[PDB]
């Protein structure tokens, strides 16, 4: 069996990581991705992010960093190691920098 | 050998007399006949049991921990019948042997003996249980006069360096052996694995010896070098370069 990987991204990095063979839709027909189209309501990028965060079938969550930032509240609140949230880069929005939710554990050291 | 035997059911005054006959003989042999005398006094713990009884027969009140208050001055009168003296070629060397209750070093008998004598050789229950003989533990043991006995013209020039380096390797080996149960053997470095090899071969070859096997100091030092040669010579930091140059390499 094994876990999936899940994707929360701009539409172009949900064609990426899908032409990469990641991700299904389950027997309940729940999907495995979210597409933050420009008129997305800010709640949506938490409402599904909480559904992934407490499902059993999701092993990794890949989030473009600018839409981890829209939910920096709900995302830094994840203290467990069960689903690993990777704050990937995006297209024209700048790449992965400081401000990452996991690297911050090493505050006096990195 | 002169041998004096006092049995467990001989008169308890003969036990008080026994060290005094032995030391009165050693004083004649050393300081009139010019011999080097070794004196072995066996269970000073049995001697103190008789001293406490003669004290009770005098109707004295029991002192600190139940022994006579004067037991230091009494033991010092036995132990200071020792030494070299000016103008005579003999000497007296004493090896007292003692049994401690509860394996406790803080009891009056070993404690007062420590204030008068100059070192200890420590016999260990764990080495004995591990079936090692003689079960002498070198980490708590000490001879305070060792630097005066050893070296060029008295043993061999490398003796101090070999003794210092064997102690240093064994003290690290016991510490690596402890962390091996915490971190597991796959987390140990190549240098930890050298200390872990030295530790086993030190106890099987240097410490373990037969009850009828006699090693000179030269054989003891050569068994010492066979173990030090387990290490790259850069590891042997207690040994100076001159001693490493003369003794680290094997020769035909």
């Amino acid at each position: 069996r094994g876990k999936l990987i899940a994707v929360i991204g701009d539409e172009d990095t949900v064609t990426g990581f899908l032409l990469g063979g990641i991700g299904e839709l389950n027997k309940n027909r729940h999907p495995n991705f979210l597409v933050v189209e420009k008129d997305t309501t800010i709640n949506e990028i938490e409402d599904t992010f909480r559904q992934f965060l407490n499902r059993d079938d999701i092993g990794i969550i890949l989030i473009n960093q600018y839409i981890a930032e829209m939910v920096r509240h709900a995302l830094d609140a994840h203290q467990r190691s069960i689903p690993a949230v990777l704050e990937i880069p995006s297209k024209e929005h700048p790449y992965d920098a400081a401000k990452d939710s996991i690297l911050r554990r090493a505050k006096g050291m990195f | 050998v002169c041998l004096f035997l006092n049995l467990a059911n001989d008169p308890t005054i003969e036990r008080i007399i026994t060290p005094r006959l032995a030391l009165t003989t050693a004083e004649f042999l050393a300081y009139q006949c010019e011999k080097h005398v070794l004196v072995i006094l066996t269970d000073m713990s049995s001697y103190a049991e008789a001293l406490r009884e003669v004290s009770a027969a005098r109707e004295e009140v029991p002192g600190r921990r139940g022994f006579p208050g004067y037991m230091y001055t009494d033991l010092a009168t036995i132990y200071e019948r020792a030494g070299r003296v000016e103008g005579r070629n003999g000497s007296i060397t004493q090896i007292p042997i003692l049994t401690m209750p509860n394996d406790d070093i803080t009891h009056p008998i070993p404690d007062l003996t420590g204030y008068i004598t100059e070192g200890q050789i420590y016999v260990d229950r764990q080495l004995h249980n591990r079936q090692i003989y003689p079960p002498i533990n070198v980490l708590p043991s000490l001879s305070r006069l060792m630097k005066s006995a050893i070296g060029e013209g008295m043993t061999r020039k490398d003796h101090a360096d070999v003794s210092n380096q064997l102690y240093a390797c064994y003290a690290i080996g016991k510490d690596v052996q402890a962390m091996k149960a915490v971190v597991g053997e796959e987390a140990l470095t190549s240098d930890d694995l050298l200390y872990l090899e030295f530790l086993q071969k030190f106890e099987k070859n240097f410490i373990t010896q037969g009850p009828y096997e006699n090693r000179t100091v030269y054989e003891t030092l050569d068994i010492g070098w066979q173990l030090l040669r387990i290490f790259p010579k850069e590891m042997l930091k207690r040994i100076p370069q001159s001693t490493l140059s003369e003794f680290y390499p094997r020769d035909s």
């Binding site: 094994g2 876990k3 990987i5 990426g16 990581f17 032409l19 990469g20 063979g21 990641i22 092993g59 990794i60 890949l62 467990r80 190691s81 690993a84 990777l86 990937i88 996991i102 554990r105 | 029991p62 600190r64 921990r65 915490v182 971190v183 597991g184 987390a187």
Partner: protein, 86 residues
């Protein structure tokens, strides 16, 4: 395993030329991402076990050893009293 702590990690397993180039160029990205989540699931699990261990080293040094030493000092003091009464 690290000093008897067990760390969770992940293992990837797998079930027109421009599209083939794109399939290579994305597949080689999920091989970073499934590695990096092995490092982040390890790191977040290992940080917890250091805190629990440092708290025990502190509790033994500041709480447990001093209580033993105070007990042991009282016993010696009371045995001197019994000896003086006797």
């Amino acid at each position: 395993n690290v000093a008897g702590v067990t760390l969770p990690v992940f293992e990837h397993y797998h079930e027109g030329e421009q599209l083939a180039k794109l399939k290579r160029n994305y597949a080689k990205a999920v091989e970073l991402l499934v590695e990096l989540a092995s490092l982040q699931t390890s790191f977040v699990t290992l940080d917890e076990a250091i805190k629990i261990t440092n708290r025990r080293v502190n509790a033994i040094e500041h709480v447990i050893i001093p209580r033993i030493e105070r007990t042991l000092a009282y016993i010696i003091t009371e045995l001197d009293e019994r000896e003086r009464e006797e």
